[PDB]
Amino acid sequence: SALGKLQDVVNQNAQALNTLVKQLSSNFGAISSVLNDILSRLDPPEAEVQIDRLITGRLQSLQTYVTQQLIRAAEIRASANLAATKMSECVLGQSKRVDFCGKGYHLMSFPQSAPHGVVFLHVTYVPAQEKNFTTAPAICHDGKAHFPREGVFVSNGTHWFVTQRNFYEPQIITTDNTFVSGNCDVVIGIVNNTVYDP
Amino acid sequence: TRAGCLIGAEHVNNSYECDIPIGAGICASYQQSIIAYTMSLGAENSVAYSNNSIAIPTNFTISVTTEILPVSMTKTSVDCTMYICG
Amino acid sequence: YTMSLGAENSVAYSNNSIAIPTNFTISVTTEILPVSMTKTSVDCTMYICGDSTECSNLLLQYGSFCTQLNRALTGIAVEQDKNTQEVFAQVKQIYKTPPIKDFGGFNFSQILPDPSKPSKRSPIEDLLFNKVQKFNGLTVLPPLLTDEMIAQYTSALLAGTITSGWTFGAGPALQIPFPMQMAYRFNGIGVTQNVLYENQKLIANQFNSAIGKIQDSLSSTPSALGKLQDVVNQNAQALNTLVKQLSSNFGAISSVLNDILSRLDPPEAEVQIDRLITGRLQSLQTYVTQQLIRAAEIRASANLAATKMSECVLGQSKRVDFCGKGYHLMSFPQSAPHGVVFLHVTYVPAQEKNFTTAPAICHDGKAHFPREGVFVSNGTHWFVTQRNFYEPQIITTDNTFVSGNCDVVIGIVNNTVYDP
Amino acid sequence: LTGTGVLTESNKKFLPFQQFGRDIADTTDAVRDPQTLEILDITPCSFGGV
Ligand SMILES: *[C@@H]1O[C@H](CO)[C@@H](O[C@@H]2O[C@H](CO)[C@@H](O)[C@H](O)[C@H]2NC(C)=O)[C@H](O)[C@H]1NC(C)=O
Ligand SMILES: *[C@@H]1O[C@H](CO)[C@@H](O[C@@H]2O[C@H](CO)[C@@H](O)[C@H](O)[C@H]2NC(C)=O)[C@H](O)[C@H]1NC(C)=O
Ligand SMILES: *[C@@H]1O[C@H](CO)[C@@H](O)[C@H](O)[C@H]1NC(C)=O
Ligand SMILES: *[C@@H]1O[C@H](CO)[C@@H](O)[C@H](O)[C@H]1NC(C)=O
Ligand SMILES: *[C@@H]1O[C@H](CO)[C@@H](O)[C@H](O)[C@H]1NC(C)=O
Ligand SMILES: *[C@@H]1O[C@H](CO)[C@@H](O)[C@H](O)[C@H]1NC(C)=O
Ligand SMILES: *[C@@H]1O[C@H](CO)[C@@H](O)[C@H](O)[C@H]1NC(C)=O
Ligand SMILES: *[C@@H]1O[C@H](CO)[C@@H](O)[C@H](O)[C@H]1NC(C)=O
Ligand SMILES: *[C@@H]1O[C@H](CO)[C@@H](O)[C@H](O)[C@H]1NC(C)=O
Ligand SMILES: *[C@@H]1O[C@H](CO)[C@@H](O)[C@H](O)[C@H]1NC(C)=O
Ligand SMILES: *[C@@H]1O[C@H](CO)[C@@H](O)[C@H](O)[C@H]1NC(C)=O
Ligand SMILES: *[C@@H]1O[C@H](CO)[C@@H](O)[C@H](O)[C@H]1NC(C)=O
Numbered sequence: 001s002a003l004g005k006l007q008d009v010v011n012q013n014a015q016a017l018n019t020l021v022k023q024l025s026s027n028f029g030a031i032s033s034v035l036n037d038i039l040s041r042l043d044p045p046e047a048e049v050q051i052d053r054l055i056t057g058r059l060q061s062l063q064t065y066v067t068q069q070l071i072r073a074a075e076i077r078a079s080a081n082l083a084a085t086k087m088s089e090c091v092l093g094q095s096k097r098v099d100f101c102g103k104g105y106h107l108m109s110f111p112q113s114a115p116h117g118v119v120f121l122h123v124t125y126v127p128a129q130e131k132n133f134t135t136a137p138a139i140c141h142d143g144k145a146h147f148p149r150e151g152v153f154v155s156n157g158t159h160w161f162v163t164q165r166n167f168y169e170p171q172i173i174t175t176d177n178t179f180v181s182g183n184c185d186v187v188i189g190i191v192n193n194t195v196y197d198p
Numbered sequence: 199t200r201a202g203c204l205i206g207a208e209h210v211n212n213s214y215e216c217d218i219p220i221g222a223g224i225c226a227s228y229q230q231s232i233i234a235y236t237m238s239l240g241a242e243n244s245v246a247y248s249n250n251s252i253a254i255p256t257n258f259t260i261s262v263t264t265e266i267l268p269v270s271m272t273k274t275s276v277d278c279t280m281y282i283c284g
Numbered sequence: 285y286t287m288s289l290g291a292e293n294s295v296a297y298s299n300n301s302i303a304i305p306t307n308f309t310i311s312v313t314t315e316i317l318p319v320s321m322t323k324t325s326v327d328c329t330m331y332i333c334g335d336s337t338e339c340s341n342l343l344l345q346y347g348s349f350c351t352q353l354n355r356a357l358t359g360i361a362v363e364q365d366k367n368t369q370e371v372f373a374q375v376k377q378i379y380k381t382p383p384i385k386d387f388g389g390f391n392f393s394q395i396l397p398d399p400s401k402p403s404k405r406s407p408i409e410d411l412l413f414n415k416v417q418k419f420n421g422l423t424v425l426p427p428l429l430t431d432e433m434i435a436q437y438t439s440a441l442l443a444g445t446i447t448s449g450w451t452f453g454a455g456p457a458l459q460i461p462f463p464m465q466m467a468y469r470f471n472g473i474g475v476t477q478n479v480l481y482e483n484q485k486l487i488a489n490q491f492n493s494a495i496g497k498i499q500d501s502l503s504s505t506p507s508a509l510g511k512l513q514d515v516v517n518q519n520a521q522a523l524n525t526l527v528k529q530l531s532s533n534f535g536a537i538s539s540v541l542n543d544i545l546s547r548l549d550p551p552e553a554e555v556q557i558d559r560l561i562t563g564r565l566q567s568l569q570t571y572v573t574q575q576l577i578r579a580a581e582i583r584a585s586a587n588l589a590a591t592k593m594s595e596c597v598l599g600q601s602k603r604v605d606f607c608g609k610g611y612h613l614m615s616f617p618q619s620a621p622h623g624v625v626f627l628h629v630t631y632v633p634a635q636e637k638n639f640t641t642a643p644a645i646c647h648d649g650k651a652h653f654p655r656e657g658v659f660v661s662n663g664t665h666w667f668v669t670q671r672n673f674y675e676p677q678i679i680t681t682d683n684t685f686v687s688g689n690c691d692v693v694i695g696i697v698n699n700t701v702y703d704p
Numbered sequence: 705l706t707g708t709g710v711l712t713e714s715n716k717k718f719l720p721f722q723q724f725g726r727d728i729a730d731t732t733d734a735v736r737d738p739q740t741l742e743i744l745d746i747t748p749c750s751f752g753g754v
Contacts, residue, residue, distance in 0.1 A: 002264070002266070003266060005266045005267070005268060006266060006268060009268045009271060010272070013271060013272050013274065017274065019348055019351075019352060020276070020281075022347065022348060023347045023348065024281075025347070026345060026346060026347035027345050028345060028346060028347075029345055029558060035283065035284055036284075054282075055282055055283070057346065057347075058281065058282040059282055061347070061349075062276065062278060062281055062282065064349070064352065064569070065276070066276075067573060068352075068356075068576075069274070071573075071576050071577065071580065072271065073271060074580060075580065075583075076268055076269075076270065076271045078584070079267050079268040079269065080267075080268070080269045080270065082267060083267040083268075083269050086265070086267070096602060097594070097595055097599075097601075098450070098453055098454070098594040098595050098598050098599035099374070099453070099594035099595075099598065100591075100594065100595075102261070102263040102265065103261075103263060103454070104261055104454050104455060105454055107260075114266070116268060116269060116270045116271065116272070117266060117267055117268045117269045117270070118266075118267055118269050119264060119265070119266050119267075120264070120265040120266075120267075121262050121263070121264060122262065122263045122264075122265060123260060123261070123262050124260075124261045124262075124263065125258055125260065125261075126258060126259050126260070126261045126454070126455045127255035127257075127258050127451070127454065127455040127456060127458070128255055128257040128258050128259050128455070128456075129255060129256050129257035130253040130254055130255045130256065130456060130458055131253065131254065131256055132246070132251060132252075132253060133251070133252050133253070133254055134250055134251060134252075135250055135251065135252040135460075135461065135464065136250065137461075137463065137464060137467065137477075137481050138478075138481065145478070147476075147477055147478050147481075148477075152252060152254075152464070154252060154254065163254065165254070165468070166255065167254075167255055167256075167258065168254045168255060168256040179476075179478075181476070181478040181482070181675075182478065182482055186481070186482050187478075187481045187482070187484075188388065188463070188481070188484055189249065189250060189461075189463075200426050201425070201426055202752060202753075216428070219365065219428045221425060221426040221427070221428055222426040222427070222428075222430055223428070223429065223430045223432070223433055225428075237428075237433075239373070239378055239433055239436055239437060239440070240375065240376050240377050240378050240440075241376075241377055241378065242377065242378045242379075242380065243377035243378065243379055243380075243457060244379075244380050244382075245379060245380075245382075245443070245444070245447040245448050245452075245457050245459045246459050247381075247382045247446075247447040247448075247459050248382075248459070248461070249386055249388065249461050249462075249463075250461060251459055251461070252458070252459060252460050252461070252464070253448075253451075253456075253458035253459050253460075254458065255455070255456075255458070325753065327753070330751075335708060417729070419727075419729070419731075419747070419748050420729060420731075423752065423753065524728070527728075527729045528729070528730070530729065530730075530731070531729070531730040531731075542706050542707055543706075546706055
């Protein structure tokens with residue numbers, strides 16, 4: 001069922017064609033669905049009446065088919081446009097768009113050929129094995145408020161570290177990985193710690 | 199049910215992922231006999247929120263997922279005159 | 285009158301002048317999108333022939349037209365549940381907010397479910413829901429997901445967004461203090477995190493006010509949900525038209541099938557019936573075709589709504605005007621009748637003032653460029669500041685970088701770069 | 705006036721000259737009984753998809 005999305009397209013079109021063909025067996029009020037039988041039995045003055053009934057029915061059947069194909073074609077076009085977007089993005093570049101190039105943090109994608117369609121293998125980074133830390137919006141040191149330049153301030157229960165947000169990597173808090181703005185009397189939840197100067 | 203009268207399926211209190219949709223939150227599945235149930239929207243997950251607690255991944259995995267999209271349709275062509283009149 | 289395209293606004297452009305916001309506001313805007321359409325179902329044979337066997341037998345002479353019509357409407361009905369699922373069922377777990385709503389001053393009581401209500405809807409969702417044939421074979425099938433279930437998906441998305449930010453939309457839900465989450469979202473728009481913390485009280489107040497405005501704006505603006513009402517009106521109108529067509533003769537002696545059958549014998553009755561079948565079949569084909577075209581429009585809207593759930597809600601967007609006007613911070617989904625409402629929270633620059641600027645500073649014969657911000661002058665002194673929020677720092681070697689000499693950059697100015 | 709359905713007592717305020725009524729579909733949904741002058745509502749016999 002994995003490729004049901006492609007099989008459904010094939011099935012819908014095959015079904016539409018089969019329906020169109022079957023309609024040729026309908027009388028539509030005529031003495032016969034077979035045009036040759038009408039012509040072999042009747043002269044034009046009467047044959048034309050029976051034929052007119054078949055033309056109306058068959059023309060209507062064909063119009064129905066074409067209309068459905070145009071509507072269906074529009075759906076396929078929209079899908080193709082999405083597939084094209086996911087080729088430029090995802091494959092020919094890294095996407096920042098959530099769930100656009102798979103679930104998780106998109107790294108890269110690889111296209112694969114498929115019957116009347118395309119298959120994308122999306123490679124994503126998925127965070128795992130998280131653990132609880134105590135955090136703070138800022139560190140108070142020398143009466144000044146220090147903020148992390150890239151990561152977040154976390155405590156393992158005894159010591160404060162600064163770490164990148166998407167992967168635990170507890171670095172010593174230093175003046176080279178923080179910046180200062182304002183004093184310690186402004187930030188709510190600011191904690192007292194030491195900021196190391198190399 | 200709201201959808202109508204469902205006969206032959208055994209209604210149960212246990213909620214499961216929807217298999218065959220009936221309507222109005224009701225689904226049916228084969229579990230053996232056919233049963234009816236109110237579909238689950240997923241397991242509940244309480245986040246350990248506080249004003250000073252953060253969760254940080256110490257590991258990660260590389261996941262590969264498959265996305266399948268239609269690109270083209272069979273290029274059918276119908277000869278109107280032949281179809282109608284042979 | 286000749287319509288205005290807007291007020292004229294001359295920008296005070298020059299080769300050395302920059303305007304920089306000294307303040308900002310938190311704006312909340314509402315985007316309303318159709319997600320689903322009423323799942324109508326028409327019994328072709330009953331619509332055309334009622335319970336007449338004589339008509340039904342004539343209807344068979346037309347082949348499988350009724351099968352196609354029943355199938356097309358069924359296909360639409362299925363799509364409508366798919367549309368809803370794609371938009372709302374984007375979370376595998378049902379997340380819950382904590383008993384204690386302490387988010388650092390940020391009040392979400394208007395978007396979170398109200399526990400005092402049997403419907404378990406938010407104050408805003410309740411408002412949205414308050415704002416917005418059978419006998420002829422035209423029935424309506426219920427949605428797979430009831431309003432209650434859609435509300436549950438929405439509340440799960442809200443709980444996730446509030447307590448774990450966008451992490452739950454990528455992997456596991458990782459808790460984070462709301463103020464800290466907002467700080468990350470400020471960084472995401474080119475505004476340093478200290479701006480969030482230093483103005484945390486102000487920002488929470490601007491947010492809380494903006495949310496209150498949303499509820500009042502919707503309440504006092506009946507046309508606000510016109511986009512959802514239009515869908516309802518178009519489908520109701522189509523059904524009413526379809527029913528009315530049963531009163532047409534289409535050349536027959538009577539639009540009433542029973543009257544034809546009670547008066548005429550088959551040799552003549554079939555002629556009159558054939559006229560009604562042709563007309564009624566044509567009327568039904570017209571209806572179905574319009575529903576398929578309309579369904580496609582709804583599908584496109586649902587796809588957009590789904591995109592704006594993954595983006596905007598389950599993450600911060602960089603796309604302009606995609607998640608509201610202004611610099612997107614975050615979004616909150618709300619359940620609505622046959623659709624979704626997004627409350628987009630954006631950062632909007634305010635109270636800008638004129639500064640003199642320069643592409644580089646010349647010092648010690650070398651050209652210094654800002655690492656993150658822009659060099660600005662208040663009339664006597666040069667500072668380096670972040671581009672989206674005036675915050676004039678001393679120009680130092682720790683916030684600039686050097687490339688080339690002073691004889692290359694056009695408009696370079698002489699100043700002192702401080703070495704700590 | 706022929707048809708098939710379920711006959712029930714009507715609560716519709718028929719005027720003395722009115723013989724039958726119609727709904728928004730412009731089909732008969734009520735009749736005046738020609739002998740008793742009782743007003744009856746007409747609904748279709750239970751039906752639906754299976
Ligand atoms: C969050 O906002 C709501 C209003 O939207 C606050 O509820 C109001 O609280 C005041 C008391 O301070 C009452 O007089 C009002 O009648 C309440 N209104 C409603 C609709 O409940 C709620 O207290 C705020 N919560 C926090 C923590 O500030
Ligand atoms: C930035 O703008 C905000 C308003 O958007 C200012 O806060 C308001 O200040 C006035 C006093 O002038 C108070 O009456 C309002 O109640 C305040 N609003 C809020 C939500 O607190 C803020 O002072 C401005 N900051 C600067 C530097 O101009
Ligand atoms: C954090 O602690 C809470 C208990 O207070 C627990 O439920 C939660 O799963 C923990 N989270 C992590 C990542 O350990
Ligand atoms: C925190 O990390 C430091 C440095 O590795 C270690 O010495 C200390 O024991 C840790 N504290 C806890 C509670 O794990
Ligand atoms: C968190 O809430 C507690 C009250 O439960 C309060 O004492 C503490 O100061 C708060 N911390 C922060 C960072 O808001
Ligand atoms: C930090 O130390 C100062 C004294 O220098 C004290 O007044 C302040 O309360 C301390 N802050 C915290 C969070 O302990
Ligand atoms: C479901 O629960 C109700 C009580 O609310 C009980 O009466 C009923 O028998 C239960 N049915 C099943 C299949 O467990
Ligand atoms: C800058 O000065 C011009 C006048 O030269 C004025 O029109 C413009 O509004 C000023 N811009 C700001 C932000 O003050
Ligand atoms: C520029 O800023 C400095 C430092 O605050 C101040 O001393 C000076 O007067 C300001 N100049 C003007 C024109 O505002
Ligand atoms: C701006 O234009 C003036 C002429 O009007 C010129 O003298 C000045 O050097 C130019 N400054 C820059 C940075 O281009
Ligand atoms: C900067 O100073 C040098 C002399 O060291 C001078 O030649 C140059 O023109 C000055 N540049 C500006 C913009 O004043
Ligand atoms: C005959 O019909 C009239 C209504 O026009 C009714 O009042 C009368 O009672 C009926 N008589 C009998 C014997 O049914």
